[PDB]
Design a protein around this ligand. Structure first.
Ligand SMILES: [Ca+2]
Ligand SMILES: [Ca+2]
Ligand SMILES: [Ca+2]
Ligand SMILES: [Ca+2]
Ligand SMILES: [Fe+3]
Ligand SMILES: [Zn+2]
Lengths: 378, 165
């Protein structure tokens, strides 16, 4: 063929059928799924939707606040970095023999968001009682309409798939109590959430409201000077997210003691090391807060390591990992025609106008990324 | 002696003007403009698509642009031209072998003429694969003018492919 860079793998034209995706017992065939997605193949739309809807039915029956036992591997933000997700399972262990908890933010930013969801939802159908998924702030219509996930679905699939995902995202639990010691949430605390029972009383099946306990769990961040605050104040509006709050070491210590908990494990903020252990609780000597970020070389520019948390034998071990190669895409999935046609029209016209007139760093990436980390408008 | 036949949107006057420019460009007064006669203009030496335009203009494939060819190529840019004609011309910028279809290799090479080394070839190859994948609504693995148009028609780039004579 005409193909110049012959060695580059070309995406399969075959769309997997239901029989190729679900065995005769209705169990997702994950190895076949993983392989096709890694080559950038797609599924028949109906098969994709089945994965989404079957996944949502299982999530829908789960509690706002899940109870998860150790050993477990806890994971932070993925952000459609499908190829780093494959690496993450290698470092974390097979979900066949491993309990998993994901803290949210499966989509946006990365260009393999629908693969992450189809793959994760296939794993939830297969391991409904050992692999768990929480809602992150990006798992909503508001952020996915603003960032690229809605467009991605439109390119690779359809708005129908996008919608099925929005409905499925409304079903995701909001927190998890792990080994009866850790409260695991995507963002963090709320002035309006004092005990674990308060999370149980929320109605989560909805687009996250603009204000409130649900918005807060998903969006809250620890103060920038968490642990060394100049005040014993608890919550102050989150000027970084432009919504919800910044919570302090004293707010956390209070929540922990009141709920007889050891630490809050959350994700949401990119970390150069893939994680961050905060100030040790005065009472236990164990970090009062731990951030887990599981998207290496976030955005292809942060150059950060990623990490997962593996709790077992009473050892909370952080397993860091580096990025993996993934295919290339133009911004907003722009095709090369639309990309180059302007330059063509401009340059050939310019050519002829001329002829006729013959006769007359992590932080760098971070600060640069600021607006993208805040609550999109209205 | 012997009239010259041609197809163009131009009137007698414009054809006479274009003939004058054609003469000034025709260095060796051979009656056919050459690549080097074209490249004599410094404004053109800093333009990646000069050889694509000359080739599209050079309809008889002899390597030079005769007067008939010059007038018919410049006519694609007449203000009197239709959307289709201008898109057809854009289509032919990628369609190197003039088969009426943009192939993967043709697409890689023409884009490569414009992107250069802002993209590694692996990257450039992947976005060409996916662009064809999405636009190739016939499964022939190549882009017809119809498929090409389905993608770009709404862009209205033809409105900018207009020169004054
Ligand atoms: Ca000449
Ligand atoms: Ca010729
Ligand atoms: Ca061709
Ligand atoms: Ca085709
Ligand atoms: Fe995030
Ligand atoms: Zn987040």
């Amino acid at each position: 063929t005409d193909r110049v860079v012959k060695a580059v793998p070309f995406p399969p034209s075959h769309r997997l059928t239901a029989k190729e995706v679900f065995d005769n017992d209705g169990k997702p065939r994950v190895d076949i799924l993983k392989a096709h997605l890694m080559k950038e193949g797609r599924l028949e739309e109906s098969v994709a939707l089945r994965i989404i809807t079957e996944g949502a039915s299982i999530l829908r029956q789960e509690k706002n606040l899940l109870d998860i036992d150790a050993p477990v591997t806890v994971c932070g933000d993925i952000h459609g970095q499908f190829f780093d997700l494959m690496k993450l399972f290698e470092v974390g262990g097979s979900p066949a023999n491993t309990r998993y908890l994901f803290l949210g933010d499966y989509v946006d930013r990365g260009y393999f968001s629908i693969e992450c969801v189809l793959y994760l939802w296939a794993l939830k159908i297969l391991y409904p009682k050992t692999l768990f998924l929480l809602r992150g702030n990006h798992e909503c219509r508001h952020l996915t309409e603003y960032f690229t996930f809605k467009q991605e679905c439109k390119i690779k699939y359809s708005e129908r798939v996008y919608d099925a995902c929005m409905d499925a995202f409304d079903c995701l639990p909001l927190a998890a109590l792990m080994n009866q010691q850790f409260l695991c949430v995507h963002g963090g605390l709320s002035p309006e959430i004092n005990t674990l029972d308060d999370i149980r009383k929320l109605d989560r099946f909805k687009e996250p409201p603009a204000y409130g306990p649900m918005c807060d769990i998903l969006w809250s961040d620890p103060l920038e000077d968490f642990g060394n605050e100049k005040t014993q104040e608890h919550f102050t509006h989150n000027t970084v997210r432009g919504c919800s709050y910044f919570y302090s070491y004293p707010a956390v210590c209070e929540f922990l003691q009141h709920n007889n908990l050891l630490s809050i494990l959350r994700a949401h903020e990119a970390q150069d090391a893939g994680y961050r252990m905060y100030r040790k609780s005065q009472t236990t000597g164990f970090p009062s807060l731990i951030t887990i970020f599981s998207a290496p070389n976030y955005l292809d520019v942060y150059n950060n390591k990623a990490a997962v948390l593996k709790y077992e034998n009473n050892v909370m071990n952080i397993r860091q990992f580096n990025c993996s190669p993934h295919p290339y895409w133009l911004p907003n999935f722009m095709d090369v025609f639309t990309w180059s046609l302007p330059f063509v029209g401009e340059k050939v016209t310019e050519m002829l106008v001329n002829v006729l007139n013959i006769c007359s760093s992590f932080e760098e990436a971070k600060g640069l990324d600021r607006i993208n980390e805040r609550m999109p408008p209205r | 002696s012997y009239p010259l036949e041609m197809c163009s949107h131009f009137d007698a006057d414009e054809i006479k003007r274009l003939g004058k420019r054609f003469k000034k460009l025709d260095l060796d007064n051979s009656g056919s403009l050459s690549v080097e006669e074209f490249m004599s203009l410094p404004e053109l030496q800093q333009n990646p698509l000069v050889q694509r335009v000359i080739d599209i203009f050079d309809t008889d494939g002899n390597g030079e642009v005769d007067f008939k060819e010059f007038i018919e190529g410049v006519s694609q840019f007449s203000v009197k031209g239709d959307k289709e004609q201008k898109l057809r011309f854009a289509f032919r910028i990628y369609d190197m072998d003039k088969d009426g279809y943009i192939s993967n290799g043709e697409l890689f090479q023409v884009l490569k003429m414009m992107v250069g080394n802002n993209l590694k070839d692996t990257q450039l190859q992947q976005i060409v694969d996916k662009t064809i994948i999405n636009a190739d609504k016939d499964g022939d693995g190549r882009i017809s003018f119809e498929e090409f148009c389905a993608v770009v028609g709404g862009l209205d780039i033809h409105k900018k492919m207009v020169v004054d004579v």
